Amino acid sequence: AAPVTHIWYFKGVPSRLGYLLDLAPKDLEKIIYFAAYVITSVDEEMRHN
Amino acid sequence: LDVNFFDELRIGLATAEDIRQWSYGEVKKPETINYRTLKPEKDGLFC
Amino acid sequence: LVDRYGEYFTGAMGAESIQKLIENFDIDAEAESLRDVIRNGKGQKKLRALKRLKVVAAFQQSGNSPMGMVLDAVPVIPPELRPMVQLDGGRFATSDLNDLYRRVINRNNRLKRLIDLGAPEIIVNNEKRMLQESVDALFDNGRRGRPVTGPGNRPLKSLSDLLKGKQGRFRQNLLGKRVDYSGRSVIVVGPQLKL
Amino acid sequence: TDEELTARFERDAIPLLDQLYGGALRMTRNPADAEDLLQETMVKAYAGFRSFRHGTNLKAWLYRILTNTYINSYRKKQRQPAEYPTEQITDWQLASNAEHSSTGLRSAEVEALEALPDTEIKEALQALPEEFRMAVYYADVEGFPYKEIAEIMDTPIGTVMSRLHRGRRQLRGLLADVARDR
DNA sequence: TTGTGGGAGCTGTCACGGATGCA
DNA sequence: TGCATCCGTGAGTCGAGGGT
RNA sequence: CCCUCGA
């Protein structure tokens, strides 16, 4: 019902997701297990105008 | 019968599309087999 | 930040967010930035960028999109490879794999029920986290946090364990195996034999 | 006032989650089980939150929902096949199970012999005439219905039945090794 | 589904390499 | 940002028969 | 898999 990350690529040291998105594994832990939000997109034109 | 002359053996990541192209149906129920008839429940892990 | 400014950005928690990021991810752009950093830079930034490039350059060869690192569908191993056998006593013995898949199924279905009932976001988020954790156990138990335990506080062997160690398939069943036309017995000297 | 009800929920019931989880851990002793049971309690509690009388202590109400879902869990597990999870299924266990199964752990030799001729039976069948051997083979080796056996040998049903009963008689005579197997 | 309400264990292991994270 | 810490890896073979 | 034992 909800997508799920493969633990091989999140927690397997070195975090391949961390290297992929240039994210600290600490922050990936916060995100994936619902401790903190992440900004997925932003409308820069609307913000500017 | 396989002649057992495979050139190469290759991995990659499976896509959800690949995972569904392998599957013969979704396991929707957690029940395994009937406590009475010892038969695999429908849509379960042994369906 | 969402009450105001809400229609100016999208934010979210969890694997769905990671999936969105991977969707918006420009692999050529980041690969070029990293190549630049490793060519014209020096020091530990050079080394960390070489590390980070080993992943992106690999995802940059013959398709292989990083989207495969996030899953919407979990494959379920054939049931012969995860047997369930009746025991003397009327009790059953199941491989751990079935308990793991069963926890995944239970939590996914409970999440379906919550989504349908329009439950509070805190509760549905709890269920999504639990689903992530149960798939993490199914794939590699104990790798993050506590391992799912069976009776006697025994960690259930996941799909990763089935492959690793001197008990996994490689060392226990492929590089050596039990054979037919073979026997065993005590040895005695027998000095009358020829070499 | 539906969204008002769910907001009242997020205000009142959610801060009780820590104590409710402590209790679920007390009565399950397995943290994954306690999380499952607490989320079940929350489903069963948000389903009927109108049925709770605002103002009274909702700690005790939610605790009763918790204890009742635990009791239903115990009663439902008592009605399931009792499963013990093992890291590996033992060879002794495979064999013990095979002792009461419709097909045993068959050996390569058994399979090989079954794929080799059964000389006493093959010779007896070859003694029959062609029509009789074919009728008995189609009838009670392949199990076809009599009309189909007719349609394969393009003879009426009556004469297939004749050939069948008389080939059965002839083979019953030919097989004195029934006493060796009967 | 209403006065109350946090587990049972556990460390009595060691050497090494490298990411992680922290000031 | 330069390391210190924390984490994750590995730790012999084959046998017997009794157990969850 | 664990327990006790064998070389």
Give me the DSSP letters along chain B.
Answer: ---S--------PPPHHHHHHH-SS-------B-TTT--BPTTSTT-
The strand pairing partners of C71, in sequence order, are A4
For residues D44 and D38, the answer to whether their CB atoms sit within 8 Å is: no
Chains B+D touching (3+ CB pairs under 8 Å): yes
Tell which residue, A33, B13, D60, D70, has the closest CA to residue C144: A33
Instruction: Tell me the H-state helices in D48-101.
Output: 58-77, 91-98
Pairing of strands D83-86, C92-95: parallel
Tell which residue, C68, C25, C148, has the closest CA to residue A5: C68
For residues D78 and D38, the answer to whether their CB atoms sit within 8 Å is: no
For residues C143 and C136, the answer to whether their CB atoms sit within 8 Å is: yes
Quote the radius of gyration of chain C (alpha carbons, Å): 26
For residues C86 and C68, the answer to whether their CB atoms sit within 8 Å is: no
CB within 8 Å of A37: residues ≥ 6 apart: A31, C11, C12, C13, C17
Interface touch C13/A31, C-beta < 8 Å: yes
| Side-chain half-sphere exposure of D157, counting CA atoms within 13 A | 5
Interface touch B33/D83, C-beta < 8 Å: no
D81–chain B Cβ distance below 8 A for any pair: yes
Breaks (C-N over 2.5 A) in chain D follow: none
Task: Say if residue D63 is exposed, middle or buried (CB neighbours under 10 Å; 0-12, 13-18, 19+).
Answer: middle
How close C147 gets to chain D, by Cα (Å)? 9
CA–CA gap between residue A41 and residue C21 (Å, rounded): 8
The most distant pair of C-alpha atoms in chain A lies apart, rounded to whole Å, by 43
Method used to obtain the model: X-ray
CA distance readout (Å), D143 to C110, D135, D162: 48, 11, 17
> What letter would DSSP give residue A41?
E
Of C88, C95, C113, the CB nearest to D86: C95
Query: B45: which 2 tokens?
Result: 């892990």
Peptide bond into A14 cis (omega under 30): yes
CB within 8 Å of D161: residues ≥ 6 apart: D146
The most distant pair of C-alpha atoms in chain D lies apart, rounded to whole Å, by 94
CA–CA gap between residue D171 and residue D129 (Å, rounded): 11
Pairing of strands C84-86, C92-95: antiparallel
Kindly tell me the sign of the dihedral angle through the C-alpha atoms of D102, D104, D108, D114: negative
Query: D126: which 2 tokens?
Result: 């070859």
Q: Which residues touch strand F (CB under 7 A)?
A: A 11, 13; C 43-44, 89, 93, 143-144, 151-152, 164-166, 171, 176, 178, 184; D 84, 86, 90, 92-93
CA distance readout (Å), C179 to B1, D73, D138: 22, 46, 41
CA distance readout (Å), C195 to C62, C157, C190, C192, D149: 61, 48, 11, 10, 67
CA–CA gap between residue D166 and residue C86 (Å, rounded): 46
What type of residue is B32? T
How close D72 gets to chain B, by Cα (Å)? 16
CA–CA gap between residue D81 and residue C94 (Å, rounded): 11
Task: Tell me the CA–C1' distance in angstroms for C166 and F1.
Answer: 42
The strand pairing partners of A5, in sequence order, are C70
